[PDB]
Amino acid sequence: GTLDAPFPEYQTLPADPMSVLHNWLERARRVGIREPRALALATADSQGRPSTRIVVISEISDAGVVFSTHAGSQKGRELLHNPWASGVLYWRETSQQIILNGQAVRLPNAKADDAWLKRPYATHPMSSVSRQSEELQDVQAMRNAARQLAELQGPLPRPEGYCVFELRLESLEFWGNGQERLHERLRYDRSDTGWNVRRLQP
Amino acid sequence: ESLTGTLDAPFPEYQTLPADPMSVLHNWLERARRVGIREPRALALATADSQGRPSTRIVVISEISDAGVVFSTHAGSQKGRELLHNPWASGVLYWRETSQQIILNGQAVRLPNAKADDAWLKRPYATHPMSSVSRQSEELQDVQAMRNAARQLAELQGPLPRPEGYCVFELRLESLEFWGNGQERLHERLRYDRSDTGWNVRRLQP
Ligand SMILES: Cc1cc2nc3c(=O)[nH]c(=O)nc-3n(C[C@H](O)[C@H](O)[C@H](O)COP(=O)(O)O)c2cc1C
Ligand SMILES: Cc1cc2nc3c(=O)[nH]c(=O)nc-3n(C[C@H](O)[C@H](O)[C@H](O)COP(=O)(O)O)c2cc1C
Ligand SMILES: O=C(O)[C@@H]1CC=CC2=Nc3ccccc3N[C@H]21
């Protein structure tokens, strides 16, 4: 759109999409894309009905990307029975998308403890009182209970349901606007020995 | 905290619980237009394959209908193939400037070809050549060949026939959520689910 949007990988077909992912994200940070790690994450229920919401990617790992949430949320309950998920990053400023597909696996509690402690302590009170995605019966009661905890010197204990998922990637697509509406689509699929890569028609 | 929004985003509906969620959708979209949100109708649309594995991509909401939202695509694309077997979908709008999300869940129905003809004609004609030559989401074997083919069609400098497979879907909504940042991190989540008659409305915990 409004900012420079280089996509040399569409020509060169790099072998490792995780390198491409790292490079796109680092560039997004450098050029000042607004909230580049806001991932629209899709899960599905036992009938195959998708649900979506934004989550923040907290880190990139060897196998994929990592985010935190509550296990009893809708996404948590869906992932418990159906680990397959997909997320899209969309950067308006550069007209670029990254699509991330794979299986999300809940990481151990020590990882969750560390993630919880790395959040700003001001987030701990509400995340402790709320049972994410359950019906809220009394707004003021929640507000007041969190205010009681906000008086404390953080950090608070990690709540039982606070968890970290790693989305272990099986495929990725990098999308750019291209020239003459020939949008540039670079698609990776995991193989037994590495990754296959192809271009897709726009 | 990753949230960067700083624009006031009134959410009286979280207090008043309107019976009819499409009015809330209209209110929020109209405000987004008035305050200048960038691409508010860029919808991250999720579909699922035959085994329930999701896929996602951005599409644009072209219209708000009585039942839901409308978008166009190619029937042979991944999303089109997925929807034709499993009509259930979900999409999310996220507006950074106001820290608002809208989650839209329902069943997508392919509209008649007359509707697709009209939508096709409403697109700028400069978009017609590439959309005609491209079989969306199939492997692209020769970039230059596609480029050259589209350039030849573009010489017409006018509208082309609607391609087989260019289609319009209406996502007929079964549930919605309106999410606002709220105060003191008590994010404001207003959730609607269709009932036998009308809608049920609830607040959700953040
Ligand atoms: C910009 C943004 C970032 C968010 N990041 C997270 C996150 O990382 N983890 C989380 O659980 N919820 C996050 N949320 C809240 C989710 O969108 C959602 O409301 C919540 O996770 C419940 O989703 P569910 O009911 O579909 O499970 C974020 C919301 C916004 C607007
Ligand atoms: C801002 C933006 C808007 C888009 N709008 C549409 C659209 O309305 N319809 C469409 O078919 N593809 C649209 N695309 C392209 C899709 O994201 C996607 O690449 C294409 O539809 C193929 O998706 P699929 O392979 O998952 O079916 C848009 C892409 C961007 C970046
Ligand atoms: O950037 C952030 O902190 C996110 C902004 C809005 C809501 C969030 N909810 C979370 C819930 C659990 C774990 C992380 C979250 N991130 C924030």
Tokens 């394959």 identify what position? B49
Each as own residue / partner, the long-range contacts of residues B41-44 (CB below 8 Å, 24 or more positions apart, any chain) are B41/B93, B42/A90, B42/A92, B42/B93, B43/B69, B43/B71, B43/B91, B43/B92, B43/B93, B43/B104, B44/A40, B44/A42, B44/A52, B44/A88, B44/A90, B44/B91, B44/B92, B44/B93, B44/B94
Structure tokens at B180: 């606002």
Distance separating alpha carbons of residues B137 and A187, to the nearest angstrom: 10
What is the maximum span of chain A, computed from C-alpha positions, in angstroms? 58
Closest ligand 1 atom, residue B101 Cα: 31
Rounded to whole angstroms, how far apart are CA atoms A112 and B39?
Answer: 35
Establish whether the linkage from the previous residue to B18 is cis, with ω within 30° of 0.
no
Cβ pair B189, A126 in contact under 8 A: no
Please tell me whether residue B187 adopts helix, strand or coil conformation. Answer: strand
- Domain coordinates in residue numbering, chain A: 1-202
Q: How far apart are CA A92 and CA B101, in angstroms?
A: 16
Distance, CA A55 to ligand 3 centroid (Å)?
A: 7
Query: Would you say the CB of residue B17 lies under 6 angstroms from ligand 2?
Result: no
Cα A45 from Cα B123, distance rounded (Å) = 35
**Amino acid residing at B194:** R
Cβ atoms of A1 and A92 within 8 Å: the answer is yes
The residue type of B5 is G
CA–CA min distance B5, chain A (Å): 10
Q: Please check whether residue B22 is in contact with residue B65, taking contact to mean a CB–CB distance below 8 angstroms.
A: no
Residue B180: its chain A contacts at CB < 8 A?
none
What token pair was written down for A84?
């397959």
Question: What is the count of residue pairs from A and B with beta carbons less than 8 Å apart?
Answer: 176
Query: Distance between alpha carbon A138 and the CA centroid of its chain, in Å?
Result: 30
Q: Which of these, A41, A36, A140, A56, lies nearest to B44 by C-alpha position?
A: A41
The CA distance from A27 to B48, in Å, is 31
To the nearest whole Å, the CA of B46 is away from the closest chain A CA by 6
Rounded distance between C-alpha atoms, residue A99 and residue B146, angstroms: 23
DSSP one-letter code for A135: B
Contact between B93 and B59 under an 8 Å Cβ cutoff? The reply is: no
User: How far off is chain B from A108, nearest CA to CA, in Å?
Assistant: 23
Q: What element of type H or E holds B120?
A: helix B113-122
How far is the C-alpha of A34 from the C-alpha of B85, rounded, in Å?
Answer: 36
- According to CATH, the superfamily of the domain at B1-206 is Electron Transport, Fmn-binding Protein; Chain A (2.30.110.10)
The answer, yes or no, to whether any atom of ligand 1 lies below 6 A from the CB of A68, is: yes
Ligand nearest to the CA of B71: 2
The DSSP element (H or E) to which B55 belongs, if any, is strand B54-60
Residues A7, A77: Cα–Cα separation, whole Å: 37
Cα within 13 Å of Cα(A147), Cβ side: 8
**Chain A residues whose beta carbon lies within 8 Å of the beta carbon of residue B202:** 135-136
SS3 breakdown of chain A: % helix, strand, coil, rounded to 5? 30, 40, 30
Rounded to whole angstroms, how far apart are CA atoms A185 and A105?
27
Residues B60, B130: Cα–Cα separation, whole Å: 18
Ligand 1 pocket, residue A65 CB under 6 Å:
no
Superfamily the domain A1-202 falls into: Electron Transport, Fmn-binding Protein; Chain A (2.30.110.10)
Instruction: Look at the block and give the residue holding tokens 């009905």.
Output: A49
Give the H/E segment covering residue B44: strand B42-48
What resolution in angstroms does the PDB record give? 1.5
For residue B125, give the 3-state DSSP assignment. helix
Phi, psi of B165 (to 5 degrees): 95, -20
Residue B152, token pair as written in the block:
């030849």
What does each C-alpha distance from B99 to A128, A165, B2, B104, B200 come to in angstroms? 22, 24, 10, 17, 25
Task: Pick the closest to residue A24 from A198, A188, A200 (CA basis).
Answer: A188
Give the C-alpha separation, B30 to A118, whole Å: 38
Mapping DSSP to helix (H, G, I), strand (E, B) and coil, where does residue A7 land?
coil
Task: Tell the burial category of B12 from Cβ atoms under 10 Å away from its Cβ (0-12, 13-18, 19+).
Answer: exposed
Is residue A70 within 8 A of residue A116, CB to CB? The reply is no
A chain contacts of residue B56, beta-carbon cutoff 8 Å = 40, 42, 52, 86-88, 99
Q: Cα–Cα distance between B148 and B129 in angstroms, integer?
A: 11
Q: What is the 3-state secondary structure (H, E, C) of A150-198?
A: HCCCCCCCCCCCEEEEEEEEEEEEEEEEEECCEEEEEEEEECCCCEEEE
Q: In the beta sheet, which residues pair with residue B102? A: B93, B178
